[PDB]
Amino acid sequence: TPPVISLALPSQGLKVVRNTDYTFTPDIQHSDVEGFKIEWVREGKIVSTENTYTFNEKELGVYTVTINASNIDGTTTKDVSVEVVETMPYVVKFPTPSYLQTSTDRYTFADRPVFLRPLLEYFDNPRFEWSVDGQVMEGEVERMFKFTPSAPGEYTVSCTVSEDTPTEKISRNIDKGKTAVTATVKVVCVDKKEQDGFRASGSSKLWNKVYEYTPAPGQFINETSTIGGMTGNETSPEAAVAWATQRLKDKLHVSLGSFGGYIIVGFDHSIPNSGNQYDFCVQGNAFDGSSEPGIVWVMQDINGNGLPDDEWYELKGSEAGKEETIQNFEVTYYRPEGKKMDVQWISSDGRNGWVDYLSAYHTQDYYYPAWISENSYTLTGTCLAARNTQDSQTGYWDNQSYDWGYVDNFGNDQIEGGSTVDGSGQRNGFKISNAIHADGTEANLQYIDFIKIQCGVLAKSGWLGEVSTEVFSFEDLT
Ligand code: CNC
Ligand SMILES: [Ca+2]
Ligand SMILES: [Ca+2]
Ligand code: NA
């Protein structure tokens, strides 16, 4: 009397969700017999010898799972067809260096940590497991994993993000359980030493190239008056780069729009981490009451290809580490369904709001950038706590200052020269020594090759419109 396997399926077949645990608990008649063994076989190999087995697959398709049970009276076998047919919006992905870049590969020098951190969608209560080259890293259970290669080569890092989602009975023998989504990212430890990537020489102290101009929505985006300077031709990322390039050459404003908007520039040489007061400066238009702080991020061309596709490092400012500052904030903007409308956003803290359309001042059809093809996009960055406030007596708005560390901000790190009346010629100076790793520790960069300015507040001030960093120039001061 060998064993027989009972495993009830839905009458319509077993149609399951991707990235979701299904536990199979078959009834084994004559499990009492001496010499009882059970095996679970998938694509030839034995995946389990327990009485239950849990399935979870990422790819849609039909998977065959074979059960084999034995005792001293004979053997038996059963085949269950598991059809992965439904998706759910749970996503784990590693970030690229900018909106328009698609590679997730990461680059570092030997003995320099890389702080790996996935972006998540739909997760509310995530748990983390990390692996390097197939080996689970015991004790690494946090949203970031600090990985430090000690030798050149390529390393495959895997992160499984799980969430305790509600259990469901699928049949007498099948239970739907937790969600678990896996993503992988390649870390390249380059063969070079950091010092050997210093680009000496150089012909200009100014920025030499704009690589990308991806603002957030704002009243100066697609603004075609003489005040805005756009032409209507900025309908592609290449045209946006050409426009920003000419504006910066002429030291005319480039607005980043609302939170997260950014521009990426480089130089024809590396800017050293120097003993001067400042290593570089950025021209804003701040005056007292008109602070629209931009977060400064810097990048070394670790992989040597001339492109800003390596690691960004934040320059800490006066608000770094305060519990009210939000690292790794995300804002998603939506192109409105018609012309002359407010631009809606939702943020990663669960808030929602909009950038106001101001028909009195900026009369273009859209404040969402014309050259962002997609009808929604998500920008990340450090978000400072907003301090724009309206005086009720006068009704006037005060976009209040931060102490130091930010672009277009009337703080303590300004370089003499700008008008305190209208902000023309205003500059802030910056120190590469303020560069930090993602956990707040010192990055100790010897030099930088690229700068990204990221609008650092999500706010608006009535008839002033959104709080939006403007930049006008970039200069190596060493
Ligand atoms: C257009 C403009 C400007 N304005 Co008004 C005028 N006229 N502003 C306005 C309009 C902005 C509309 C919009 N775009 O959403 C408008 C009508 C709302 C306005 C209002 C005011 N402005 C006023 C003043 C005096 C000035 N503003 C000027 C900035 C003066 C500018 C003079 C100039 N630069 O030529 C100006 C001509 C050009 C600004 C600009 O487009 N910059 C380009 C943009 C890309 O940069 P930005 O950093 O984002 O500019 C922002 C700030 O300028 C802010 N803002 C504008 N005005 C002020 C004034 C103050 C005190 C503060 C703190 C912020 C502002 O709004 C702009 C858009 O967000 C000013 C330098 C002109 C001057 N007299 O020399 C002067 C401020 C001097 C100072 N205190 O340091 C008012 C007090 C006038 C009034 N009502 O009595 C009032 C105060 C606003 C407030 N704080 O609540
Ligand atoms: Ca590069
Ligand atoms: Ca602005
Ligand atoms: Na400004």
Automatic annotation (TrEMBL):
<feature type="domain" description="Bacteroidetes PKD-like">
    <location>
        <begin position="2"/>
        <end position="71"/>
    </location>
</feature>
<protein>
    <submittedName>
        <fullName>Cell surface protein</fullName>
    </submittedName>
</protein>
